[PDB]
Amino acid sequence: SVETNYLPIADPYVMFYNNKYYAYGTGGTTAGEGFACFSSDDLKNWKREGQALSATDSYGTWGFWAPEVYYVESKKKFYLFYSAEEHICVATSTTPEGPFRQEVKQPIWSEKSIDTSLFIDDDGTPYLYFVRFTDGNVIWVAQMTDDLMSIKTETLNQCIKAEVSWELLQGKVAEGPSLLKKNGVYYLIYSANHYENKGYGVGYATSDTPMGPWVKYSKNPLLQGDAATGLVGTGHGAPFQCKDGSWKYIFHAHWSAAEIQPRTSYIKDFAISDQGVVTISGTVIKPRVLK
Ligand SMILES: [Ca+2]
Numbered sequence: 001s002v003e004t005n006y007l008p009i010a011d012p013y014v015m016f017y018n019n020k021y022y023a024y025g026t027g028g029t030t031a032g033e034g035f036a037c038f039s040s041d042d043l044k045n046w047k048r049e050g051q052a053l054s055a056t057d058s059y060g061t062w063g064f065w066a067p068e069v070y071y072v073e074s075k076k077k078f079y080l081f082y083s084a085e086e087h088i089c090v091a092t093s094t095t096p097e098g099p100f101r102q103e104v105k106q107p108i109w110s111e112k113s114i115d116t117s118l119f120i121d122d123d124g125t126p127y128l129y130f131v132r133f134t135d136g137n138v139i140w141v142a143q144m145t146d147d148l149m150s151i152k153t154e155t156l157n158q159c160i161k162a163e164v165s166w167e168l169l170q171g172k173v174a175e176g177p178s179l180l181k182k183n184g185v186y187y188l189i190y191s192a193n194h195y196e197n198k199g200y201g202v203g204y205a206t207s208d209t210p211m212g213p214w215v216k217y218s219k220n221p222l223l224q225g226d227a228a229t230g231l232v233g234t235g236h237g238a239p240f241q242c243k244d245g246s247w248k249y250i251f252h253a254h255w256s257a258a259e260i261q262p263r264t265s266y267i268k269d270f271a272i273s274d275q276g277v278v279t280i281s282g283t284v285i286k287p288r289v290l291k
Helices: none
Strands: 002-004 010-017 020-026 034-040 045-054 065-072 077-084 087-093 114-120 126-132 138-143 157-160 174-182 185-192 201-207 235-241 247-253 264-272 278-285 288-290
Touching: 010 264, 020 045, 045 065, 045 077, 065 114, 077 114, 087 114, 114 174, 126 174, 138 174, 157 174, 157 185, 174 235, 185 235, 201 235, 247 278
Parallel strands: 010 065, 010 235, 045 288
Antiparallel strands: 002 288, 010 020, 010 247, 020 034, 020 065, 034 045, 065 077, 077 087, 114 126, 126 138, 138 157, 174 185, 185 201, 235 247, 247 264, 264 278
16 A cells, blocks of 8 residues: 655665665655655565664754665765755764664764765775855765764865856855765766745765865756656756666655645656766656555
8 A cells, every 4th residue: 555656855875785776865754854765676665673873862853854875895884965944964874774873973074064965985085075155055075084973184176166157046156965886987966046935956966086186077967857757856866776787866855846844855867878978867756655
C-alpha cells in the first residue's frame, strides 16, 4: 500500500551502498526535527527506514537542512554532513539508516553556513563545499582535517556567486554544491536563485583543481523546470551512480505551480560526456513511498 505518491523531501541526496539506494533530505521527518532515511531497490518505490538523525543527538533545534551521507572507506563508518540553525555539522553512524549522532553537539566552525558537500580526491585530501553569506549565498571550499570534523580555515577559497541572468531571477544565491571529478577535471554542480522562485535551477562550473579557479558552463542552466511534467522550482540536487553503471540526478521541485510547500523529490538522467559536458535529461522518475 501507498504512504505517499511523492518522495517528501527537499535538498535530496542519494547514497548507493551495498546494492541499495538511500535517500536523505530536508523535511519529511516522522519523529521530530532532524533527517529521515528512505531506501529503495529500483528508485521508483521507496520505503522509510526511520529517523537517521534526531535533534537531541545534534547541535541545534531548528533548521535541519541539506543532509549528505557518505561511507568513508578510510574510517569504515558513515558520515552525515548537514546544516542546523544555519551552521554546518557532522555526525556519524555505523549503519546507513542511523542513528547518526554527534559525541559533542557543536558545528564544524562558528560562522553561519549551510549546504555541506564533501569530496575526497584521488590524493586522499578531503574538501568540504558549503555556502557562506559573503555576497549573497556564495559557495566556498576548504580542506578538511584528517578526522573530517574541522575545516582548515587557511585553505578557504571562493568558488561560485550568483552573476549571470538565469542566476539572478530572485535574490543573490548560489548554493547546494555537488562535486564530481572525471578525466582530470573537477565539476562543481550548483543551484541558483532563492528556492521559492519557480526559476530555481541547476548549473555547473569546471576547474583543473578542487579549489578553483572556476569557469561556468556557457549553456547553464542544466535544469530550470522540467517541460514534460511541468515541475518548477527544480534544484538542490545530487548526482549518483546506479546498479547498472549509469548516472542519475535527484532533485526537488515545488509541490505544484500554485504552491511551493511541501517540496518533493524527483530523478532524471545524468552524464558527463567524453568532451567534458554535463547533461541532466530524460523522462522524470516520479518516486513514491510504500509501507
Ligand atoms: Ca546537498
